[PDB]
From a paper:
Terpene synthases (TSs) are the enzymes responsible for the considerable structural diversity found in terpenoids. They achieve this by catalyzing the conversion of a single linear, isoprenoid pyrophosphate precursor into a highly reactive, cationic hydrocarbon skeleton. Sce6369 has been defined as a class I 10-epi-cubebol synthase (ScCubS), and is responsible for most of the sesquiterpenoids observed in the volatile extract of S. cellulosum So ce56.23 ScCubS is capable of making over 20 different sesquiterpenoids when expressed in a heterologous Escherichia coli host, the majority of which are derived from the germacrane, cubebane, and cadalane hydrocarbon skeletons. 10-epi-Cubebol synthase from Sorangium cellulosum (ScCubS) guides a highly reactive carbocationic substrate through this pathway, preventing early quenching and ensuring correct stereochemistry at every stage.
The crystal structure of ScCubS in complex with the trinuclear Mg2+ cluster and PPi was determined at 1.80 Å resolution. ScCubS crystallizes as a homodimer and exhibits the class I TS structural features, comprising a bundle of 17 α-helices and a central hydrophobic cavity, showing structural similarity to other solved bacterial sesquiterpene synthases. Docking of FPP into the ScCubS-Mg32+-PPi complex (PPi removed) and sequence alignment with previously characterized TSs suggested several residues that could provide the highly tuned control observed in ScCubS, namely, F104, S206, F211, A244, and N327. The polar side chain of N327 points toward C11 of FPP, the position at which the first cyclic intermediate contains a positive charge. It also binds a water molecule close to this position. F104 is on the opposite side of the active site to N327, with its phenyl ring well placed to stabilize C7 of cation C by cation−π interactions. 1,10-di-epi-cubenol, however, is delivered by hydroxylation of cation D at C6, suggesting a role for F211 in promoting the conversion of cation D to cation E, and subsequently to 10-epi-cubebol. F211 is positioned “above” the substrate according to the scheme shown in Figure 1, and C7 is sandwiched between F211 and F104. The “PPi sensor” R202 is linked to S206 via T205, and the carbonyl of S206 is well placed to interact with C3 of FPP. S206 and its neighbor T205 occupy the so-called “kink region” of the G-helix of TSs,25,32 a short, flexible region that moves toward the substrate in response to PPi being sensed by R202.
Residue numbers in the entry:
A (entry chain B): 32 to 136, 143 to 338
B (entry chain A): 32 to 138, 144 to 337
The structure:
Amino acid sequence: ALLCPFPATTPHPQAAQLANDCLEWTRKCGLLPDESPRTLDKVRSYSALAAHCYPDAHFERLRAICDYYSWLFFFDDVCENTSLNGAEPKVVSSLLFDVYGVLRGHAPFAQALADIWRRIGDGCPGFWRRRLIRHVENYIDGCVWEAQNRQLDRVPSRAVFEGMRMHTSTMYEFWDFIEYAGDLFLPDEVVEHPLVAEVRRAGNAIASFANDIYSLRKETSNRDVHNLVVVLMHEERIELEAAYARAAGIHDAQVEHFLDLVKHLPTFSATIDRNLARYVEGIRIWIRANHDWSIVTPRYN
Amino acid sequence: ALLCPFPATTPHPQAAQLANDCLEWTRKCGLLPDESPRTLDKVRSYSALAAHCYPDAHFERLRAICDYYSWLFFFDDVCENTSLNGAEPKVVSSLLFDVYGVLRGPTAPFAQALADIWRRIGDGCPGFWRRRLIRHVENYIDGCVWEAQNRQLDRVPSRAVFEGMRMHTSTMYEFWDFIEYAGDLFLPDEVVEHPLVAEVRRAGNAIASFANDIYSLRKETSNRDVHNLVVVLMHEERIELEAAYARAAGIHDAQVEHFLDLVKHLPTFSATIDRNLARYVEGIRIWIRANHDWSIVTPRY
Ligand SMILES: [Mg+2]
Ligand SMILES: [Mg+2]
Ligand SMILES: [Mg+2]
Ligand SMILES: [Mg+2]
Ligand SMILES: [Mg+2]
Ligand SMILES: [Mg+2]
């Protein structure tokens, strides 16, 4: 039902082993809420997503990303539930900063994140580490804002939600990981160039709004409001199906916008231009992978 | 210092009478905190800004816009002081929604004065434009409640989150809306929401807002406020003030160059719409230069 003009890509050749190793790591780190087939299948699903998003990565880099996918799904759920079940924003803030603090210098999640970070950190330069950390700090701010909305029993206005969703989605982190997974790093002058930044935002919006459309049933069952469809219903005073259609239109316009923008990328140098082209291709791969996965993942379905 | 590539324009020829009339309206409505000459000169200065920002508007439209400039300065200051002096976000939210609720109809000096402005503006605009303005007001309210959140939590927001929220707290999207009202030429939703046009609107918002942060830093820090690009840079990048001014100027200048490029590739819609879009973009240019010339000399900063 959504515009997805990007072709599918063969997943990483070691996808099966990746899922097995990742599941064992999540268990050993104590991150599984239970050992039901539903829970284990979800972890296997996240690992399938990772293997389709970064199909050309060296195995051990993909393994670290894969661990982060599962770690983040679980910890974001913990932080969401903390807020949904009535915690003050200060408590949500303390939880996030306490766990993510290991990126600069605590229950199951701090130690497990430190383990991921030790492996990723060894394969990346400082300027990229600061870039990822900033995107994490952006996400934390976005999550504390969500917690404030819940404390105030508020549905955010659409323009503000769409902006903040770019942070809560963590997709900027997963663009960062395109560089890590390919071992091809872009200088700040490139990713911060306003045209490239708008490409990154558009791809974020495509993936995040697709997630919203497909994750709507789960989030509404959870009494959560941070979903483009719910936000559209409240702002425009429309019913669910009409809001789905508006959300799809917004998604599709971002797709068209992305495709236009990437035809007019700024130029820097033969080497940087080639790395930027691989980075943008990585975003295209991620978008299609996310699209196909969202339709079938048991997390939403 | 800051890049301003947009030539200046003569102000509205009735600028002097406009300032006199606006001051008398501001006094009659009871919005003046006191009758000192520096308070009165602030109103005169904001009316001078209005007369430079919409120099071709019919006088009665410019007059309503002018009353809103001064109304907004005073009321935004009341909301800032409410939060700076310890109010919980819910109190800030209630103050804002109670006063701005009159944009939807009759429901305090500020609410009555806003209703008077809105009665006049509404008589000269279609419904879709009124909803657009009201939505941008609601975005700004969300932005202000978020600032109150940060102050309650003693948080300096990370830069990317601040820059996105600053687009709403600046109210510049409302003043782009007023370009349509001032010229009595209204763009359909499909045009202003087109992602390329939206990015033009955002870039212009950033140019004006980040210039305002740079020039309005000395007074915002004497107010114990952190919602300023320069301060946000110091905390995020761990740099000293002059370095942060330099970074902020570079970010401003990159948005300017981005804007200059984007407006050469506007989408086409129809004969009349394209003509009106060209006037709208030119209005943003006029506004940006008018704001630049005024910010350097205004008593407010
Ligand atoms: Mg979430
Ligand atoms: Mg979630
Ligand atoms: Mg979701
Ligand atoms: Mg303000
Ligand atoms: Mg202010
Ligand atoms: Mg300011």
